[PDB]
Amino acid sequence: SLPCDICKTVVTEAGNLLKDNATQEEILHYLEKTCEWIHDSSLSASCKEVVDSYLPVILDMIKGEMSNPGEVCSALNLCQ
Amino acid sequence: SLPCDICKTVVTEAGNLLKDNATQEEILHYLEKTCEWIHDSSLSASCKEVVDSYLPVILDMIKGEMSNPGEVCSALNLCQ
Amino acid sequence: SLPCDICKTVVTEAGNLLKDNATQEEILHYLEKTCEWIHDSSLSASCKEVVDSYLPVILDMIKGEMSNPGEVCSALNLCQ
Amino acid sequence: SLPCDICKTVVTEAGNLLKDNATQEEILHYLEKTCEWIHDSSLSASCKEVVDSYLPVILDMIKGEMSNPGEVCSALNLCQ
């Protein structure tokens, strides 16, 4: 069905952007820069450690949730 | 930037949703059913007359949108 | 849980915006002006009759559904 | 006009969502639990210390990028 096939396609491209290693690093380097919004050299360092450590895990979580589009658009009742 | 293909694709596939002659019938029948929520036999007819006449005009006007990404995807976060 | 708490809050606050009578006329004048897009003195008059009669009903129906966020976010299944 | 009035309304209420002190704590408690997605008493604690400290900073930019929808919706081609 067309609203299911489009939703599946959109979800597929969201997967393709999150797998893009340049996009993976853009968010990483962005949240690294976010840490510098507080001058604290110890907290900005600890922030960079947390960001660098958790974001690849979080991206893996979203990639694992963006896989199998049929199960995503179904949980949107856009599919059967 | 690459996410501009997303803005292009989402708009393009949504365009194919409105351009789908079958989807044009799906949206019509829901707004037709909306007319029957009032028992007035004169108003239910007049609503169907307005819906059958105006909705294709509304779809075509909105079809006039989403046609060219240059005036919609331009100057936002996904292409600039 | 947060995905439920956000959904409930968004639907509840958007509902109260739709209950704010200023929002009703904002939408109303668009559909009233929409009636002038077909040069039909009987249908453009009838269009306002359909718009002025059905839009307050439809807004009240949607306002009536957004009054209970529990049944709306359940229609997103995010609270289960 | 509705494409401008929608952006003005959405940005204003989206701002009001982040301004809600219940939403302010809910985002923390989700990200606090997010730190527990890595079973580490040393790193998850350092994450919780970072989360409680930086989340108010993140809200400030987004609130600041919502303290006037008219100047943002205009630079998105949505108003003028």
Residue numbers in the entry:
A (entry chain B), B (entry chain C), C (entry chain D), D (entry chain A): 1 to 80
Sentences from the paper on this structure:
Saposins are lipid transfer proteins required for the degradation of sphingolipids in the lysosome. These small proteins bind lipids by transitioning from a closed, monomeric state to an open conformation exposing a hydrophobic surface that binds and shields hydrophobic lipid tails from the aqueous environment. Saposins are required for sphingolipid degradation by lysosomal hydrolases; in particular, SapA acts as a co-factor for the enzyme β-galactosylceramidase (GALC) by solubilising its galactosphingolipid substrates. Although individual saposins have low sequence identity (less than 35%), they adopt a common fold consisting of four amphipathic α-helices.
Here we present the crystal structure of a unique tetrameric assembly of murine saposin A produced serendipitously, following modifications of published protocols for making lipoprotein nanodiscs. Four SapA molecules in an open conformation form a diamond-shaped assembly possessing three orthogonal two-fold rotation axes. This symmetry is not perfect as the individual monomers possess small differences in the conformations of loop regions and the C-terminal helix (RMSDs 0.8–1.4 Å over 80 Cα residues), resulting in non-crystallographic symmetry of the tetramer. Each chain of the tetramer interacts directly with the three other chains burying a total surface area of 1210 Å2 for each monomer, representing approximately 20% of the SapA surface. The equivalent dimer within the tetramer structure is very different, possessing a head-to-head arrangement of monomers and substantial direct protein-protein interactions. Comparison of these structures suggests that the tetrameric assembly of SapA is not compatible with binding to GALC without some structural rearrangement. The core of the SapA tetramer structure is hollow and potentially solvent-accessible if it is not filled with amphipathic molecules. Considering the highly hydrophobic nature of the internal SapA surface, exposure of this hollow core to solvent would be thermodynamically unfavourable. It is therefore likely that disordered PC and/or DDM molecules are present in this internal cavity.
